[PDB]
C-alpha cells in the first residue's frame, strides 16, 4: 500500500488550493497533518471515510476541508502567509501506518524570481574550501550540485534564509589544492520555479 500526493504548490494570499492523496489499494479513514518549516507536526483533523464525517482541530476549522473521490483531498481557502508548510496525509490498517510523501505549499505575494549565483573563491594548504552564493530567489527550493554531481564529498548546502520576500543560500565545497584551480570546479544551481539553471566556474582571484 502507498499514498501519493500532488506536487508542490505556490499560491497568493487569499487563493485556494487542493491537495490530492491517492492510494493504490483503498476502509479505516484518513488524517491530515501540517508541518511548518523547522517546526513540529500539527494535526489538522481526520475523515471517517466510512461515515464521511470530517473532524477538524480548532485552528483549521473553516478554511480547511476534507473530501473524497481513491483520492482524498485537502482543500484550503483564503490562504494566509502562515499556511506555508508541508502537508501530509495518512491512513492506518493492520499493524502499521501509511503516510504520503508530503506536499509543500508556499503562500506569498512575492513574485517568482530566479537567483543570482556568485562564485566564492579564496582571498595555501593541501585542502581548499570553495563556495557559491545563491542570492535573491523565490520561491523555494533550489537544487545545488558541484561539477554536475561528480563532486559529492566534502560538500554541504546551508538552509536558505528569507530576506525581503526573497531567499538567499550558499553552498560549501572542500577539495584538494592539487585539484583546484588545476581542475575545473563549477557549481550548478537549478531553480525549478523559474525553470532556470545556472553554472558558475570557481575562478581563483
Amino acid at each position: 500500500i502507498q499514498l501519493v500526493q500532488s506536487g508542490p504548490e505556490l499560491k497568493k494570499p487569499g487563493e485556494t488550493v487542493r491537495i490530492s492523496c491517492k492510494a493504490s489499494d483503498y476502509t479505516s479513514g484518513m488524517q491530515w497533518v501540517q508541518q511548518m518549516p523547522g517546526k513540529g507536526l500539527k494535526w489538522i483533523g481526520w475523515l471517517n471515510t466510512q461515515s464521511g464525517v470530517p473532524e477538524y482541530a480548532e485552528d483549521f476549522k473553516g478554511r480547511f476541508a476534507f473530501s473524497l473521490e481513491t483520492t482524498a483531498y485537502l482543500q484550503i481557502n483564503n490562504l494566509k502567509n502562515e499556511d506555508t508548510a508541508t502537508y501530509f496525509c495518512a491512513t492506518w490498517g493492520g499493524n502499521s501506518a501509511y503516510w504520503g510523501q508530503g506536499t509543500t505549499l508556499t503562500v506569498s505575494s512575492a513574485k517568482t524570481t530566479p537567483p543570482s549565483v556568485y562564485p566564492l573563491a579564496p582571498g595555501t594548504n593541501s585542502m581548499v574550501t570553495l563556495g557559491c552564493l545563491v542570492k535573491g530567489y523565490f520561491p523555494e527550493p533550489v537544487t545545488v550540485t558541484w561539477n554536475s554531481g561528480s563532486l559529492s564529498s566534502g560538500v554541504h548546502t546551508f538552509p536558505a534564509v528569507l530576506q525581503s520576500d526573497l531567499y538567499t543560500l550558499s553552498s560549501s565545497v572542500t577539495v584538494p589544492s592539487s585539484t583546484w584551480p588545476s581542475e575545473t570546479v563549477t557549481c550548478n544551481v537549478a531553480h525549478p520555479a523559474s525553470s532556470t539553471k545556472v553554472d558558475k566556474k570557481i575562478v581563483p582571484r
Partner: protein
C-alpha cells in the same frame, strides 16, 4: 482538548547507549498513543501504536510503555539510523494532538570550526552589491556565535546566518554568515574579519582579509 507534553526537547547520545523519551497527557488517553520517527523532513514512520505495540518491521530495541497520562518510548543500543526526531501522537479524543517533539542527535568529540572568509565576487561588485561570506564548517557541539569586524570594529546590521543540521557522515554542524553591503559601503573599508566563538577555544577562532591585498 488533551495536550501532550513531550520531553526532553533535545537529547544527545552515542551509538550503543540507551535513551528514554517521555510524553504526558493532560488527560487520560487509555493507551491510545502512537510514537513516530521523522528524518530529514521526510515522512514520519510509525514506531509504536496503542502505547506498547510495535509497528510492522520496527526493530525490537524500540519499546513503549505507560498508561493513563504517562508514557515513554525507550530506545536501547542506539543504531546510527535511530537518530532523528521523535513525536508522540494520541488519538483518544479529538483533536489528536502531537507532542512537541524530541530531537535525538549524535554525540561525538568536540571539534573546532574550520573558518573560511570570502570577499565579494567580481560579478557581484560589478552589479553594485557586496556580500562578504564566512563559513564555519564541521564543528561540534552545535553551539556557536559569530561576530563580524570591519576595520577593527564590530558589525551587526546586514548579517544573516544559516545553520545546517547534524551531518549524517561525521556528526558535525556547519554555519554560514553573510554580511551584505553596497559596493560603496564595502569600498569605504579595508579589513574584514569573521570571528567565531566556540567551546573548543577561549579565544576567537578567526579568519580575515583586506581589500588592499
Amino acid at each position: 482538548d488533551i495536550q501532550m507534553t513531550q520531553s526532553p526537547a533535545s537529547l544527545s547520545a552515542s551509538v550503543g547507549e540507551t535513551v528514554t523519551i517521555t510524553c504526558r497527557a493532560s488527560g487520560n488517553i487509555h493507551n491510545y498513543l502512537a510514537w513516530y520517527q521523522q528524518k530529514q523532513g521526510k515522512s514520519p514512520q510509525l514506531l509504536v501504536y496503542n502505547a506498547k505495540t510495535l509497528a510492522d518491521g520496527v526493530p525490537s530495541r524500540f519499546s513503549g510503555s505507560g498508561s493513563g497520562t504517562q508514557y515513554s518510548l525507550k530506545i536501547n543500543s542506539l543504531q546510527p539510523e535511530d537518530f532523528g526526531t521523535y513525536y508522540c501522537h494520541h488519538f483518544w479524543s479529538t483533536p489528536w494532538t502531537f507532542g512537541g517533539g524530541t530531537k535525538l542527535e549524535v554525540k561525538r568529540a568536540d571539534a573546532a570550526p574550520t573558518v573560511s572568509i570570502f570577499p565579494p565576487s567580481s560579478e557581484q561588485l560589478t552589479s553594485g552589491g557586496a556580500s562578504v561570506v564566512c563559513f564555519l564548517n564541521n564543528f561540534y557541539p552545535k553551539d556557536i556565535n559569530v561576530k563580524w569586524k570591519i576595520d577593527g570594529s564590530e558589525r551587526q546590521n546586514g548579517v544573516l546566518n544559516s545553520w545546517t543540521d547534524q551531518d549524517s557522515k561525521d556528526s558535525t554542524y556547519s554555519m554560514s554568515s553573510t554580511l551584505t553591503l553596497t559596493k560603496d559601503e564595502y569600498e569605504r573599508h579595508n579589513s574584514y574579519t569573521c570571528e567565531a566563538t566556540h567551546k573548543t577555544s577561549t579565544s576567537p577562532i578567526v579568519k580575515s582579509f583586506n581589500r588592499n591585498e
